[PDB]
Design an enzyme around this catalytic site. Structure first.
Site, PDB file in Angstrom:
ATOM      1  N   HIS A  31      -6.197 -16.077 -12.407  1.00 25.41           N
ATOM      2  CA  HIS A  31      -5.000 -16.654 -12.984  1.00 25.41           C
ATOM      3  C   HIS A  31      -4.342 -15.741 -13.978  1.00 25.41           C
ATOM      4  O   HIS A  31      -4.904 -14.730 -14.399  1.00 25.41           O
ATOM      5  CB  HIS A  31      -5.269 -18.009 -13.683  1.00 25.41           C
ATOM      6  N   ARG A  66       1.278 -18.281 -22.992  1.00 24.06           N
ATOM      7  CA  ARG A  66       1.343 -19.304 -24.019  1.00 24.06           C
ATOM      8  C   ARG A  66       2.716 -19.953 -23.952  1.00 24.06           C
ATOM      9  O   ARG A  66       3.732 -19.261 -23.837  1.00 24.06           O
ATOM     10  CB  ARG A  66       1.056 -18.779 -25.428  1.00 24.06           C
ATOM     11  N   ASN A 110      -0.789 -24.110 -28.259  1.00 24.52           N
ATOM     12  CA  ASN A 110      -1.465 -24.173 -29.535  1.00 24.52           C
ATOM     13  C   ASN A 110      -0.728 -25.204 -30.377  1.00 24.52           C
ATOM     14  O   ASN A 110       0.462 -25.083 -30.678  1.00 24.52           O
ATOM     15  CB  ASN A 110      -1.525 -22.783 -30.219  1.00 24.52           C
ATOM     16  N   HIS A 169       6.735 -10.147 -15.442  1.00 24.80           N
ATOM     17  CA  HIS A 169       7.001 -11.453 -14.901  1.00 24.80           C
ATOM     18  C   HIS A 169       5.944 -11.795 -13.898  1.00 24.80           C
ATOM     19  O   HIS A 169       5.009 -11.039 -13.655  1.00 24.80           O
ATOM     20  CB  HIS A 169       8.358 -11.422 -14.153  1.00 24.80           C
ATOM     21  N   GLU A 220      10.270 -14.232 -10.751  1.00 23.66           N
ATOM     22  CA  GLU A 220      10.872 -13.647  -9.588  1.00 23.66           C
ATOM     23  C   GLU A 220      10.578 -14.535  -8.392  1.00 23.66           C
ATOM     24  O   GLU A 220       9.431 -14.887  -8.157  1.00 23.66           O
ATOM     25  CB  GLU A 220      10.360 -12.222  -9.353  1.00 23.66           C
TER      26      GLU A 220
END
Lengths: 128, 128
Positions: free
Chosen positions: A5, A9, A60, A74, A122
């Site tokens: 993965h 954030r 957070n 990206h 994208e």
């Protein structure tokens, strides 16, 4: 080994889930909360983590903004209908930084968008 | 639909390529160069782009440093031996930020390292 993965954030968890799922068509794989460190997580993706790479969004508590910086590029996603996705992305808040169209010197339809936190996405309209 | 790749801007193309391929075990999937926009790309991954998610390493000619910022989290990779990977990485252009070990209140072994450009990479381990 494999790519599991990509962690990003976010300023607002639910808003992020909402976008990736309701707009990009991803599914909420799982979410977790960490009282000790004051943060919440959500993994969104097109398939099971066991078989593919997904996105890990981190929130957070009390933190609604980050510094994007200039290093991160990206995330590119395969799209069913770039044109349409742009529309959905458009009418659902997000920005379209590059309208759907064939790529320069090519034929493949691609577009560039931004998620709710300004992350660049994208979209590419693409064994057996 | 699926997660295609994660693009990251690097200060030195070959430096990054060596690291991800030689150290991380990835394979150079493809490269390209655009004179108009002045950049060079290298796609690295544990599988072909049609099969999995990969990483797009972007080198902007004459650009050797970026601002990592605080938004981007990391990329997680699966490893067979987190401890071994840590040592290999730390000795080969990388840096270990979080020694390999179980996560608090868990048995899953994980580590955090930094690539040559400072990008955080999470290592997740899959009767000695």
């Amino acid at each position: 080994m494999r790519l599991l993965h990509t962690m990003l954030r976010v300023g607002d968890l639910q808003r992020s889930i909402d976008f990736y799922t309701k707009v990009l068509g991803m599914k909420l794989l799982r979410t977790s909360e960490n009282p000790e460190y004051k943060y919440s997580l959500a993994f969104v993706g097109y398939g099971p983590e066991t078989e593919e790479a997904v996105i890990e969004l981190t929130y957070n508590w009390g933190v609604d903004k980050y510094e994007l910086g200039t290093a991160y590029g990206h995330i590119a996603l395969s799209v069913d209908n770039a044109a349409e996705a742009c529309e959905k992305i458009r009418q659902n808040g997000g920005n379209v930084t590059r309208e759907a169209g064939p790529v320069k010197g090519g034929t493949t339809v691609i577009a560039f968008v931004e998620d709710p936190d300004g992350y660049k996405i994208e979209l590419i309209e693409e064994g057996n």
